[PDB]
Design a protein around this ligand. Structure first.
Ligand SMILES: [Zn+2]
Lengths: 141, 116
């Protein structure tokens, strides 16, 4: 079975790296220097490095040449045991379902639990249930 | 191919049968490639929001399903190369899942993730 290798990357750039790698593979697949990589895993919970699937280290070493993003993680290629080939795909509870409880960060109701009512298919705004906390304009000027 | 690769990161959905992650423009224009005759997705937007759901996490660069352990674990070996996911939360209504079994299409839950 193929092996899964690890390569360092920048913090906050994981989907961009994935799409760039996909574009590079699609653009250099009918040439004399194809890429032998099988697949790359970029979990959402992790942020700071990405994974890559390949048999030998030379494959990914020669496959990440020229890219300016993976330059940092180029002089070291760590190998993980075979037991870690199934925990990476695990996800602990996406996270968008009506009639569920969610919390807020900005606004005035900071660090408070709320409840979802309706979701707009436009993916721009979403309703929310919460009890008001204002003073009803009696203390403020 | 260049038609399955996502164009813009913003506004991206994912299917529930084969977990095909692409951009909304491609879904409206091209639609589900691995399952089109049995889904009838090309040429409309309502069905896209009906079946596909944006509630999904995880991205994988599938390129050789025939020779890959991840494809075997996810049961996507008989699909075309593309950008898939590992956990798509959702369930089709009780009006489209019925005809899939009648036409010889096994409906399985791709939400491999655990709950609590
Ligand atoms: Zn699908």
């Amino acid at each position: 079975d193929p092996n899964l290798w690890t390569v360092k990357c920048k913090i906050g750039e994981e989907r961009a790296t994935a799409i760039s790698l996909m574009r590079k593979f699609i653009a250099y697949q009918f040439t004399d220097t194809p890429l032998q990589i099988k697949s790359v895993v970029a979990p959402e919970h992790v942020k700071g490095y990405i994974y890559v699937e390949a048999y030998k280290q030379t494959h990914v070493k020669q496959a990440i040449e020229g890219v300016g993003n993976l330059r940092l993680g180029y002089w070291n290629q760590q190998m993980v045991p075979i037991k870690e080939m199934t925990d990476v795909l695990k996800v602990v509870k996406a996270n968008l379902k009506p009639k569920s409880w969610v919390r807020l960060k900005r606004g005035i109701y900071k660090d408070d639990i709320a409840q979802v009512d309706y979701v707009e298919p436009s993916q721009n705004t979403i309703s929310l249930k919460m009890i008001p906390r204002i003073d009803y304009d009696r203390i403020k000027a | 191919a260049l038609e399955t690769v996502p164009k813009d990161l913003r506004h991206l959905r994912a299917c529930l049968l084969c977990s095909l992650v692409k951009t909304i423009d491609q879904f409206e224009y091209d639609g589900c490639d691995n399952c089109d005759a049995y889904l009838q997705m090309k040429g409309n937007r309502e069905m896209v929001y009906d079946c596909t759901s944006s509630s999904f996490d995880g991205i994988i660069a599938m390129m050789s399903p025939e020779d890959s352990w991840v494809s075997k674990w996810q049961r996507v070996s008989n699909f075309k190369p593309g950008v898939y996911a590992v956990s798509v939360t959702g369930r089709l209504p009780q009006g489209i899942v019925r005809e899939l079994k009648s036409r010889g299409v096994a409906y399985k839950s791709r939400d491999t993730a655990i709950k609590t």
